Structure 1
Amino acid sequence: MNKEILAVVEAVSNEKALPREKIFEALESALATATKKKYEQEIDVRVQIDRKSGDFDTFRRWLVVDEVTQPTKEITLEAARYEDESLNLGDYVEDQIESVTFDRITTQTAKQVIVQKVREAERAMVVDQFREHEGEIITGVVKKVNRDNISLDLGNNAEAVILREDMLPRENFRPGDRVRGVLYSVRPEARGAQLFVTRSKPEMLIELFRIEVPEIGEEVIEIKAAARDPGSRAKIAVKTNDKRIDPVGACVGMRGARVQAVSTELGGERIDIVLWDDNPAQFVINAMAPADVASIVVDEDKHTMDIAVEAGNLAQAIGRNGQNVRLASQLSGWELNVMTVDDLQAKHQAEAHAAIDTFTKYLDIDEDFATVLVEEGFSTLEELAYVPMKELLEIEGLDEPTVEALRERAKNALATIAQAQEESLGDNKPADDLLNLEGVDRDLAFKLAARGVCTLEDLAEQGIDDLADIEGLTDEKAGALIMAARNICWFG
């Protein structure tokens, strides 16, 4: 009984990483609340449990305060110091009170307070205690399978959840099955499942490789990127700083044994392992494996890459439903356009012809001179308008006067487009008319003006129904713009 009380408190601390002191403070508060419930008159109670015997004394607590608002629970500092001169503001004055008999009522109150720290909070405590598992591949037993989630038991009253999106598409779990997964998020749902576990996200692949490949766990090989189509195919990019180690060979292992162990845990998912390169073009060539790349053209401004392949390799480069190009694009971060060598040449010829037509039309130059500008790498009027004068002067046959004239023509061509944007659309002239209505860009102002709504007054006179057919204008956005127009025209 005496030692049993202390042993029980220690068992609560061990159950869900709690403290003997924190368990006692809570039992004291539980017993105070149980005694206050029994007491008809609501009076503050202070319970103190002896930490060696498990015996407990109950008081009529009197919160020492400066100004008494509740005479049944509060006492003035002057009155408290009349009984004990050592008391300060915030201390408690006591009164010999009969301790509540520990019936199954108090037992239910106190054990629930202890369960609030050793059952619900035990879930959160165990997740935190296992700092490695929180982030790495925790192992759980399937407790319950629902339509939308799987509840895992991790032990120690910790429950985790795998959501339907967090499962592999072909996995079928039964109650009692053992499941591995990455703990990717810890929230605050102590009562229930605060732990979120994934098998579908890329982190599951990374951590499986960390466990199966010692050289990744020892930080000798680094995984730089991972792209994944869960239960079908993945790509990982690996780098090493040690020139004596082949990072691809280390991740594959003897006869593919390591990559096959990871693939088997992922339900037969195909894993491609590629060498990370610091050159984006070389890295994309590696990411496109097993398809052979013939040439790459990089568009840095659009963050896109055109990949030419032999006509025989086109189907392999795209992959089933575009899976290979999509995984390569997700792994590189680049948008990847896969075409034949013939199609790439036809695209470049069409772009060169469109650039020549644009330059001939807007710069008042001959086709021969427009061709020289495109051969020197100029494709846009913006490049010609803004590029450093030194690069334009490196072109054979350009003098400083001709470069200045070409730049002035390029800027004026753009100023002619800006004049239309200002008036015809609504960037300056109609910005204070058709686009005055708050929630209308230059494009919307021109769409309004195409319906005969040319002024802020014309917009204030419209109904939502009159504007409902304008592409990009929702009824709510139409209503907001009409009200903004009315506020300016009728209430300004």
Structure 2
Amino acid sequence: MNKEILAVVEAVSNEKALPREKIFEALESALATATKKKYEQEIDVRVQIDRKSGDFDTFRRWLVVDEVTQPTKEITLEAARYEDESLNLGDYVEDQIESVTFDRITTQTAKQVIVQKVREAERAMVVDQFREHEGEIITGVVKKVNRDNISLDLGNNAEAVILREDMLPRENFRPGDRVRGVLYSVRPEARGAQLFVTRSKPEMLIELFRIEVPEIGEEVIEIKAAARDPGSRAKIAVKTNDKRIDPVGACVGMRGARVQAVSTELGGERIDIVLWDDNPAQFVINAMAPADVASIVVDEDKHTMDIAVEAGNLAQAIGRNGQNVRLASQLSGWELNVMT
């Protein structure tokens, strides 16, 4: 007789994004741990609380091993002969009957283990709300900064984390304002924080262009490569199979509208739009703009270019402290050399 499991199934039921069998597993692990700690002998009793009755029978376990320690769980092949060799070497089934009592020490350790189980079950709730949609621009309010991370939320008691290295260098987020970020690939097994969200990745700019531009949305214009100097300067690479709509004019929009939108959403980062081409030589003479081309030596084995450049455009060709050469090399994959 148990009206209490009936309270589990209707009266003290969970939030409805959590299954009932996990709650039954939580309570069965709770009573198993409670009878485990209470017995003075080192018995790893695992009790099978059957679902429909509520009451149960305490089950001290036994695994088929040939070791010398743990006699309370040490059964052998000749003990598996009692069930005549119909099992496996090492599974922890039982062949015993025990009883159960209650105590306030059992109550408090059961409270500890059930708040651990509902904690990891809520963690699995955030796991399935992550795995329902893989990679998108999201918005949450920052609520508690830290030394190495910025904790976030997505509503419904979810949490996300901006780490230190994947944010803007000009970040200033007082707790209480809404920020934009992209969850990319989080750890569903992480016991602490899981949802790793960035603000200074190429995935950020391409997802921002995806939500911004409808022809990125429906695959008319496509972006192939990207380049980032976070907060200051950027480059992305555009090719297009369609011949109707102007690609660069489309992604700059009406008087630099889309570029200024991503620039103010990114923090003043000068995203410099440039074409993507398939062939290496003509791709890179398209790609180092606004620098000028004298002669190009294309190298295959160590994946580099050699660029002759006339005098006058060296500063805007290299950027500031080698910014443009570095950004163009991690754009194209070919690191650049200086030639006059």
Shorter-chain TM band: 0.7 to 0.9
Closer/same/farther in 2, CA of residues 14 and 330 from structure 1, 3 Å limit: farther
CA offset digits 1:246-274 (Å, max 9, x no partner): 33233223333333222222112111111
Question: Would you say the 8 A contact 1:126–1:156 is kept in 2?
Answer: no
Shift of 1:165: 1.7
Q: Which moved more, 1:92-101 or 1:310-319?
A: 92-101
Q: Secondary structure at the match of 2:172?
A: coil
Q: Aligned pair in 2 of structure 1 residues 317, 71: CA closer, same or farther (>3 Å)?
A: closer
**How far does residue 95 in structure 1 lie from its aligned partner after superposition?**
9.1
Deviations 1:221-259 (A, max 9, x none): 322110100011110001122222333233223333333
- In our comparison, the structure showing a higher alpha carbon Rg is 1
Q: Aligned equivalents of 1:123 and 1:47: distance in 2?
A: 25
Q: 1:304 to 1:136 in 2, by over 3 A?
A: same
Q: Is the CA contact (8 Å cut-off) linking 2:26 and 2:117 kept in structure 1? A: no
CA distance in 1, matches of 2:32, 2:299: 73
SS in 2 for 1:59: coil
* 1:462-477 alignment runs, 5 A limit: none
Shift of 1:301: 5.6
Change beyond 3 A, Cα 1:290–1:123:
farther
**1:136-167 CA-partner distances (Å, limit 9, x unpaired):** 33444323223332223345565433232212
Moved more, 49-58 or 8-17: 8-17
Deviations 1:375-423 (A, max 9, x none): xxxxxxxxxxxxxxxxxxxxxxxxxxxxxxxxxxxxxxxxxxxxxxxxx
**CA-to-aligned-CA distance 1:350-387 (integer Å, 9 cap, x gap):** xxxxxxxxxxxxxxxxxxxxxxxxxxxxxxxxxxxxxx
Which TM-score applies when normalising by structure 2? 0.77
Report the 3-state secondary structure (helix = DSSP H, G, I; strand = E; otherwise coil) of the residue aligned with 2:143.
strand
Structure with bigger RCO (C-alpha 8 Å, 6+ apart) = 2
Q: Which residue of 2 aligns with 1:415?
A: none
What is the aligned-residue RMSD (CA, Å)?
A: 4.3
SS of alignment partner, residue 324 of structure 2: helix
Task: Give per-residue Cα distances to partners, 1:413-472, cap 9 Å, x unaligned.
Answer: xxxxxxxxxxxxxxxxxxxxxxxxxxxxxxxxxxxxxxxxxxxxxxxxxxxxxxxxxxxx
Instruction: Quote the Cα distance in structure 2 between the aligned partners of 1:309 and 1:85.
Output: 81
Deviations 1:77-127 (A, max 9, x none): 999999999999989898997864565544443444444443246336524
Provide the C-alpha distance between the structure 2 equivalents of 1:241 and 1:186, rounded to a whole number of angstroms. Answer: 33
By percentage of residues, which structure has more helix? 1
- Contact kept in structure 1, 2:7 and 2:13, CA below 8 Å: no
In 2 relative to 1, CA 252–59 (structure 1 residues): closer, same or farther, beyond 3 Å? same
Task: Identify the range of structure 1 (136-145 vs 236-245) with the bigger mean alpha-carbon deviation.
Answer: 136-145
* Deviation (angstroms), 1:190: 3.0
SS in structure 2 opposite 1:244?
A: coil
1:289-341 per-position Cα deviation (integer Å, ceiling 9, x unaligned) = 334445544345664434445544443333333323332222122223456xx
* 1: CA distance, partners of 2:303 / 2:83: 80
| Long gaps (5+) in structure 1 | 340-492
Counterpart secondary structure, 2:250:
helix
Q: Give the match's secondary structure for 2:3.
A: helix
**Do the aligned partners of 2:38 and 2:106 also contact (CA within 8 Å) in 1?**
no
Given that 1:317 and 1:338 are in contact with CA atoms closer than 8 Å, whether structure 2 keeps it comes out as no
Secondary structure in structure 1 of the residue aligned to 2:160: strand
Q: How has the CA–CA distance of structure 1 residues 113 and 169 changed in structure 2, closer, same or farther, with 3 Å as cutoff?
A: same
Matched-pair identity in %? 100
Contact residue 127 and residue 158 of structure 1 kept, 8 A: no
After superposition, where does 1:197-236 map in structure 2 within 5 Å? Answer: 197-236=197-236
1:247 paired to 2:247: yes
Q: 2:285–2:293: 8 Å Cα contact kept in structure 1? A: yes
**Equivalent-residue separation in structure 1 for 2:79 and 2:299 (angstroms):** 83
Would you say the 8 A contact 1:10–1:20 is kept in 2? no
**Displacement, 1:76?**
8.2
* SS of corresponding position for 2:34: helix
Inter-partner Cα distance in structure 1 for 2:10 and 2:265: 40
Change (3 A) 1:305 1:114: same
Secondary structure of the residue that 1:130 maps to in structure 2?
helix
**Alpha-carbon distance between aligned partners in 2 of 1:164 and 1:236, rounded to the nearest angstrom:** 24
Q: Report the 3-state secondary structure (helix = DSSP H, G, I; strand = E; otherwise coil) of the residue aligned with 1:282.
A: helix
Distance 2:95 2:126 in 1: 41
Q: Please say if 1:268 is aligned against 2:254.
A: no
The worse-fitting range, judged by mean Cα deviation, of 29-38 and 8-17 is 8-17
- Quickly say closer, same or farther: Cα 1:216–1:28, change in 2 above 3 A: same
Q: 1:214 to 1:175 in 2, by over 3 A?
A: same
Out of 80-89 and 45-54, give the one that drifted further. Answer: 80-89
- Structure 1 contact 2–54 (Cα < 8 Å) conserved: yes
- Unaligned runs of at least 5 residues, structure 2: none
Which is further off, 143-152 or 77-86?
77-86
Tell me how far 1:34 sits from its aligned partner: 1.0
Alpha-carbon separation, structure 2, partners of 1:211 and 1:95: 61
Q: Name the SS of the counterpart of 1:48 in structure 2.
A: coil
